[PDB]
Amino acid sequence: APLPELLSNNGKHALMVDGAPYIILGSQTNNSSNYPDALKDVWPSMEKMGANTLSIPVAWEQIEPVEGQFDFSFVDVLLKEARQRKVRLVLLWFATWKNNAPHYAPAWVKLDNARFPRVVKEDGDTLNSLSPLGQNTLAADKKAFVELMKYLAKRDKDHTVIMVQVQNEVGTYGAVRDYSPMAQAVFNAAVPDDLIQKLQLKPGTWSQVFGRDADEFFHAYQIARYCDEVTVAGKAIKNLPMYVNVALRNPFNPGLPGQYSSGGGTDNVLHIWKAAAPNIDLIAPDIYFRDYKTVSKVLELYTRPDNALFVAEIGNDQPFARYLFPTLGKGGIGFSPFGMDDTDYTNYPLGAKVYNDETIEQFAQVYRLVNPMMREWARLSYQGQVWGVAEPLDSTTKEQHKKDRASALTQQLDLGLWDAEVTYGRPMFWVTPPEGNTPAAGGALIAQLDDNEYLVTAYKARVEFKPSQELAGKKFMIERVEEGRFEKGKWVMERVWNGDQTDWGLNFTDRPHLLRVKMASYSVQ
Ligand code: NA
Numbered sequence: 388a389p390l391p392e393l394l395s396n397n398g399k400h401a402l403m404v405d406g407a408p409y410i411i412l413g414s415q416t417n418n419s420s421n422y423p424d425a426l427k428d429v430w431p432s433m434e435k436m437g438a439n440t441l442s443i444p445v446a447w448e449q450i451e452p453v454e455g456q457f458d459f460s461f462v463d464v465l466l467k468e469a470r471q472r473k474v475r476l477v478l479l480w481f482a483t484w485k486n487n488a489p490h491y492a493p494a495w496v497k498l499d500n501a502r503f504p505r506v507v508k509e510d511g512d513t514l515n516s517l518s519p520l521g522q523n524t525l526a527a528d529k530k531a532f533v534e535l536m537k538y539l540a541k542r543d544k545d546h547t548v549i550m551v552q553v554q555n556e557v558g559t560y561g562a563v564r565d566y567s568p569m570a571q572a573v574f575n576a577a578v579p580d581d582l583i584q585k586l587q588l589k590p591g592t593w594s595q596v597f598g599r600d601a602d603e604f605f606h607a608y609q610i611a612r613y614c615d616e617v618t619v620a621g622k623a624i625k626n627l628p629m630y631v632n633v634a635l636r637n638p639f640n641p642g643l644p645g646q647y648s649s650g651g652g653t654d655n656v657l658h659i660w661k662a663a664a665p666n667i668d669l670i671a672p673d674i675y676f677r678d679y680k681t682v683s684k685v686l687e688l689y690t691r692p693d694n695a696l697f698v699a700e701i702g703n704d705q706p707f708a709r710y711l712f713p714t715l716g717k718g719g720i721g722f723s724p725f726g727m728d729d730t731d732y733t734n735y736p737l738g739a740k741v742y743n744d745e746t747i748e749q750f751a752q753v754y755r756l757v758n759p760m761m762r763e764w765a766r767l768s769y770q771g772q773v774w775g776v777a778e779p780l781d782s783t784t785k786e787q788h789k790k791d792r793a794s795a796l797t798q799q800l801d802l803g804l805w806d807a808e809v810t811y812g813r814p815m816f817w818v819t820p821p822e823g824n825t826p827a828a829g830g831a832l833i834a835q836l837d838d839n840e841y842l843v844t845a846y847k848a849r850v851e852f853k854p855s856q857e858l859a860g861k862k863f864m865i866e867r868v869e870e871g872r873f874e875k876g877k878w879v880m881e882r883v884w885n886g887d888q889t890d891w892g893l894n895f896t897d898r899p900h901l902l903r904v905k906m907a908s909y910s911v912q
């Protein structure tokens with residue numbers, strides 16, 4: 388079975404699984420479900436969601452509870468149970484950092500500060516965040532991580548685990564960097580020539596080279612170097628794709644490093660992270676912003692020629708489901724709502740206030756649009772042209788305001804010879820202006836099959852096609868709309884949309900319909 392691998396060519400990306408592009412339609416457990424007994428409270432949600440991939444912690448404390456005494460009993464049960472249900476895994480290495488802290492390191496690590504030292508603030512007080520310049524901590528982390536990758540090498544020959552997250556939300560809250568004597572001696576010295584060269588700067592000390600950014604850039608570099616060494620070590624055993632997940636700073640008004648998790652893959656240090664950690668496949672945003680404009684900005688910032696988009700975490704409340712559409716539209720490889728288990732916990736106000744079948748259904752309904760075409764969509768996104776949108780007004784908390792909302796709820800997409808107009812919250816007949824869904828929930832996906840032909844599926848929206856350029860006196864129409872499915876990679880037609888179903892755009896409710904739309908311009912001379 389070919390190793391999973393993250394491919395990057397001509398500004399596009401693909402997660403190869405079993406020798407073909409793959410989309411993670413994911414679900415992540417709560418933080419305390421990484422035990423054999425908890426899995427019974429995980430699988431039912433995953434089945435109701437229709438997820439294809441489960442993200443779940445593997446904690447350093449549980450594989451090495453006593454130094455040198457490894458315990459993979461949980462990984463054994465997890466692999467077995469995942470294969471019975473024919474789903475894949477993303478393991479989350481919870482080790483030196485989990486939300487800035489060492490809580491998931493073994494007691495023999497997190498209680499021995501002299502061996503495994505913490506961030507010291509400028510005032511000399513100590514934060515519960517392990518310093519990236521602790522060489523013992525780096526060696527011990529790597530050692531245990533290598534043993535986990537050895538376990539996968541020997542016991543996961545068919546790659547049930549497709550990707551590994553190295554640490555969980557690295558960084559420090561409460562300070563910008565380590566100010567320990569140890570860290571001070573490294574900070575008061577020359578910037579590594581390798582960072583100097585890879586970045587277009589001039590040789591000198593950290594303060595000389597970076598000025599006002601020296602403290603935060605230093606923390607990012609040293610953390611990025613720690614996480615690269617761990618990643619190189621593990622890849623040496625088994626070369627799986629490996630990524631880091633970011634405690635986002637607000638992109639539009641971040642405040643100061645330390646209010647947000649300093650030293651993580653924040654938007655302002657993606658250049659240090661990419662220069663300092665070339666072995667880490669991608670940097671993934673953890674999205675809990677509710678407002679469309681902020682979420683949209685995060686997707687824009689994390690999708691780069693050098694960075695595949697993977698929404699490694701997103702809130703599991705209703706408004707977040709629709710962001711699947713712009714995530715896949717940007718060439719996203721995956722999307723994983725956080726806390727999708729029945730272990731009696733909710734991260735409200737971040738996620739849903741109540742976890743129940745309705746909570747899961749909001750995501751099941753969007754994943755039902757993509758599951759039937761997952762391999763075809765993944766290939767089109769890598770090799771060709773895709774688009775995706777979400778309803779761009781959030782749920783509400785006179786005559787003019789209705790015109791203003793109608794306009795805001797109308798999106799244009801340039802598909803080459805054809806444009807699509809996407810509108811939200813209106814009847815399936817006639818042209819009454821959009822008033823939006825209550826709550827906000829719609830979105831659309833389009834892939835280009837040919838100059839005049841598109842794959843379309845959408846949710847609580849209307850999609851309408853039109854020419855992209857004025858025609859030289861020709862007219863245009865829909866040539867054919869087919870609803871169908873892929874079987875063995877072949878298109879099977881179920882029915883033709885026509886008449887009422889294509890007079891007033893293409894109207895989608897909550898049910899899944901995958902369309903092939905063929906447009907034509909025609910002479911009337
Ligand atoms: Na892609």
Ligand code: NA
Binds near residue numbers: 855
């Ligand atoms: Na065009």
Ligand code: NA
Binds near residue numbers: 901
């Ligand atoms: Na169908």
